Design a protein around this nucleic acid. Structure first.
Lengths: 138, 62, 132, 65, 314, 189
RNA sequence: ACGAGACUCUGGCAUGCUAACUAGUUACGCGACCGGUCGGCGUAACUUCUUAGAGGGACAAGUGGCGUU
């Protein structure tokens, strides 16, 4: 019983392997309350705080995350965890439990289940960036 | 004079030198029967409430 | 701006006028029909044409459209236009008639008509709009 | 379509008074398989198949084969 | 005498309910296919809150699911899709057991033979294909077939004279012999394209309908037209009642049941509260399936709900 | 049970302005653990009214070039000064912030003349959204230039600015600027 | 008819297809530390993650208003 459902933000992507277990959540081998910025720790705890420890009690989740930026690896981890729990519940429990957890998560935050499509825009010549232009003089 | 509120009932148009004011129709929250036109400065939409410190001028039509 | 170009609109009009029977209100069936009966070298153009075909199907559903002309539809349209009341509106028991037209009818030799009812004429000769 | 429907050439001509530049552009006709022109049609060209003339069956006829 | 009333509505689909499948082995089990690329296996609680709830969701199709049918035993499901492939699903685990590849266009219909040994697939490729349960295509009727899309293919429930009946957008009803897969009978008479054909439970009649709105009944053993019932709209689906001598047709946004004896309308199932929002077209009935016992009829609609009607006598 | 940071509830916060009730988002769907949500509130007009007020303040804190994009620093600067507003007043910091927003938003101000003109100014009313925007901008600016070239840290200047604005005191930069704008609008009536 | 659009490249989606020791992931063995952590070793599954092909997907298509409707 496993799902491996993943989530992304910008270039960061995290894959969460969720199997039948006893409530372990690790990210890159470290426990959840140890990820780097620790200012957005609540951003990581939002899924388990919203759904409760009882719903995660029957699964072990191990997240491998790689890609760009601390604040994207966060939001990628939380998307992966939410989608992993949703998929595991859908495949191995029933549709009703999946419906309620999905409703809670989506009501709190759509980005917990649906990825943000925004990506960096290209630079065009004549300016330092995508839309800025070099100073014009007369 | 007291301060009184008025709910926006319909957005009339854009006025100003650079089109910076929205000229709007407002009906008074208490009376509910008397309405006027005023220019409001900022983004305005249906149903929001403007507090008028002065409450008896009328904006010029168009 | 979602304004369709003449390519999309003329293609949709021709497709509708030619294959009105096969089409309906469903975009996802209409696009398959278009890709089967036509040669549209792009998928986006096919989707635009199918969307306008769906819009026009809805339009013809509640009446006619100036661009389309379906041969079979005109027969049903004139069938609706073939409405005939039970009693002709021109068959009246009594018709009012002014004294002047009564005199004209008398001069016509039709002064023996019975249905005519000679109404009173107007009094004031005020039939012109005031000037100013 | 300009990259496969029009063929372009630019050349110089050395004359007495100087150089004349000549540019030649040819818009190829649409050729289905046979090399006189491109195989792909122009992207904005839509061709609608002419419907064949059918006769609506007046009565239900069953054909046994 | 016997009227049908609305008992419940099943929610959970995000797209049009395109097919409803029931089996005479699990009276509390329903399969609904939908344009959300998913098949919902329901659980019939028959409680106050809702008649049934989604129990499982079969996923794996990359486009619309056009038809779903349940095996003789309620353990396997067959689905066709606009992605061109067919899928055989194990209903216990909910995973695809087998994949059927070979159709180059959208798969419009699918059928499982009684013996659950053969599979018929009719596609927009103007093609009818035969398959085993292992996913191998045996025969392909490319010639002497419909010149247009094939909209519905159905087996005959008769142990003798195995026939498969098919309809197309060429306005023809074709009867093929399963033994050799050649055209045995051809039926003309429909004015517009055909959507569905239904074979009687005893294998004696076959009803067809479509754009023209006329439901035509053809004798299957002798091969002749019998009777043309009048429907007031496009016939999206047809089904015979398993026990009563009835025929039900999804006529536009309503369903009509006719007694095949009196040849008259028995019931007009229409559920729609009319209000100021009447400027939009009502949802259209798409799929029809009778219960195993025959006292319940499930109807799919464009508003992605499955409505259940019960024979309430009265 | 969605207290901000992990300590500040929202169930007790009362906007009590009616006019700005629809434009200050703090209460039930806008109760979040952190003032950091990525978010796409600038995509369509008026959506920023769905953004929580604490996140709007946090975004407005990243200003004057050297602090552009440093949102983690600003969420820290809000977490502190909420911890300080609670110590100074004893009230919920969210309530203090909401009261400051109410008090620091101008109700009238002057534009260029009416339909047209190039000489003087004409008084007009302020949209509720523009009221909230201007209130946040003024509070942030007052804090920013109170902390500049001073041993008083940010998250102390901002806390005192919010407290004064909630009190309506004239020791607040935002209140002074609001009064100035309102008086000029009065003179150009 | 040219130009605009269409077009090509590109960004987002696919637990559907094709398939990988110059990408991996699970699983299982063997080890090192206190069931856990192993960019420690090795070989089955397979393709979610990675690559890159084919196809799909969005059309103002659905609903409600405003419009000559």
């Amino acid at each position: 019983q496993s799902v491996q459902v993943f989530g992304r933000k910008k270039t960061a992507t995290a894959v969460a392997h969720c199997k039948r277990g006893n409530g372990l959540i690790k990210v890159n081998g470290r426990p959840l309350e140890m990820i780097e910025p620790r200012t957005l720790q609540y951003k990581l705890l939002e899924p388990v705080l919203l759904l409760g420890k009882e719903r995660f009690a029957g699964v072990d989740i191990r997240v491998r995350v790689k890609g760009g930026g601390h604040v994207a690896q966060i939001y990628a981890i939380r998307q992966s965890i939410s989608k992993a729990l949703v998929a595991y519940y859908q495949k191995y429990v029933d549709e009703a439990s999946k419906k309620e957890i999905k409703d809670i998560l989506i009501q709190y935050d759509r980005t917990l289940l649906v990825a943000d499509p925004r990506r960096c825009e290209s630079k065009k010549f004549g300016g330092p960036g995508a839309r800025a232009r070099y100073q014009k003089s007369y | 004079q007291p301060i009184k509120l008025a709910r926006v009932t319909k957005v009339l148009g854009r006025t100003g030198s650079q089109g910076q004011c929205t000229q709007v129709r407002v009906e008074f929250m208490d009376d509910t029967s008397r309405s006027i036109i005023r220019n409001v400065k900022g983004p305005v939409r249906e149903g929001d409430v403007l507090t008028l410190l002065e409450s008896e001028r009328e904006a010029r039509r168009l | 701006g979602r304004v369709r170009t003449k390519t999309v609109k003329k293609a949709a009009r021709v497709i509708i006028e030619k294959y009105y029977t096969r089409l309906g209100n469903d975009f996802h069936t209409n696009k398959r029909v278009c890709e089967e009966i036509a040669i549209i070298p792009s998928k986006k153009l096919r989707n635009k044409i199918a969307g306008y075909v769906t819009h026009l199907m809805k339009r013809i559903q509640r009446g006619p459209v100036r661009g389309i002309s379906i041969k079979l539809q005109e027969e049903e349209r004139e069938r609706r236009d073939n409405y005939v009341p039970e009693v002709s509106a021109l068959d009246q028991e009594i018709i009012e008639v002014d004294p002047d037209t009564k005199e004209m009818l008398k001069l016509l030799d039709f002064g023996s008509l019975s249905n005519l009812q000679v109404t009173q004429p107007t009094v004031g000769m005020n039939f012109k709009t005031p000037r100013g | 379509p300009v990259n496969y429907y029009v063929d372009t050439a630019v050349r110089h001509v050395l004359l007495r008074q100087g150089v004349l530049g000549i540019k030649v552009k040819i818009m190829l006709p649409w050729d289905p398989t046979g090399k006189i022109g491109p195989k792909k049609p122009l992207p904005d060209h839509v061709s609608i198949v002419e419907p064949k003339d059918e006769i609506l069956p007046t009565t239900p006829i069953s054909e046994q084969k | 005498t016997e009227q049908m009333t609305l008992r419940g509505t099943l929610k959970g689909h995000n797209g049009w309910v395109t097919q409803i499948a029931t089996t005479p082995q699990f009276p509390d089990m329903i399969l609904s296919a939908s344009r959300d690329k998913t098949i919902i296996m329901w659980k019939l609680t028959r409680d106050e809150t809702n008649y049934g709830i989604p129990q499982r969701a079969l996923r794996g199709h990359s486009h619309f699911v056009s038809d779903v049918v349940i095996s003789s035993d309620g353990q396997f499901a067959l689905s066709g899709s606009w992605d061109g492939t067919l899928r055989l699903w194990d209903l216990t685990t909910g995973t695809t057991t087998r994949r059927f590849v070979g159709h180059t266009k959208d798969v419009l219909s699918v059928a499982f033979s009684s013996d659950n040994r053969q599979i018929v697939s009719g596609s927009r490729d103007k093609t009818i294909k035969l398959w085993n349960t292992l996913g191998v295509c045996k025969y392909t009727v490319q010639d002497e077939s419909h010149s247009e899309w094939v909209s519905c293919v159905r087996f005959s429930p008769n142990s003798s004279n195995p026939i498969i009946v098919s309809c197309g957008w060429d306005k023809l009803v074709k009867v093929w012999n399963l033994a050799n897969c050649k055209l045995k009978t051809n039926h003309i008479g429909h004015t517009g394209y055909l959507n569905t054909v239904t074979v009687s439970p005893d294998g004696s009649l076959c009803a067809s309908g479509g754009k023209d709105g006329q439901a035509m009944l053809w004798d299957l053993n002798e091969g002749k037209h019998l009777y043309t019932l009048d429907g007031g709209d496009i016939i999206n689906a047809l089904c015979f009642s398993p026990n009563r001598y009835w025929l039900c047709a999804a006529t536009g946004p309503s369903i009509k049941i006719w007694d095949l004896e009196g040849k008259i309308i028995v019931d007009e199932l229409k559920q729609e509260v009319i209000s100021t929002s009447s400027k939009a077209e009502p949802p259209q009935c798409t799929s029809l399936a009778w219960s195993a016992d025959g006292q319940t009829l499930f109807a799919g609609y464009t508003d992605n709900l499955v409505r259940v009607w019960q024979v309430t006598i009265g | 049970d969605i207290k901000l940071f992990g300590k500040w509830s929202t169930d007790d916060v009362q906007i009590n302005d009616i006019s700005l009730q629809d434009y200050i988002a703090v209460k039930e769907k806008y109760a979040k653990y952190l003032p950091h949500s990525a978010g796409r509130y600038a995509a369509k007009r008026f959506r920023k009214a769905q953004c929580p007020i604490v996140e709007r303040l946090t975004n407005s804190m990243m200003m004057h070039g050297r602090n552009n994009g440093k949102k983690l620093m600003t969420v820290r600067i809000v977490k502190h000064a909420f911890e300080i507003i609670h110590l100074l007043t004893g009230e919920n910091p969210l309530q203090v912030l909401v009261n400051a927003i109410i008090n620091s938003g101008p109700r009238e101000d002057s534009t260029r003349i009416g339909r047209a003109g190039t000489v003087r100014r004409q008084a007009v009313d302020v949209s509720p959204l523009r009221r909230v925007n201007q209130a946040i901008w003024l509070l942030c600016t007052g804090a920013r230039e109170a902390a500049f070239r001073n041993i008083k840290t940010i998250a102390e200047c901002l806390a005192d600015e919010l407290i004064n604005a909630a009190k309506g005191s004239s020791n607040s930069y935002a209140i002074k600027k609001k009064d100035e704008l309102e008086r000029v609008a009065k003179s150009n009536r």
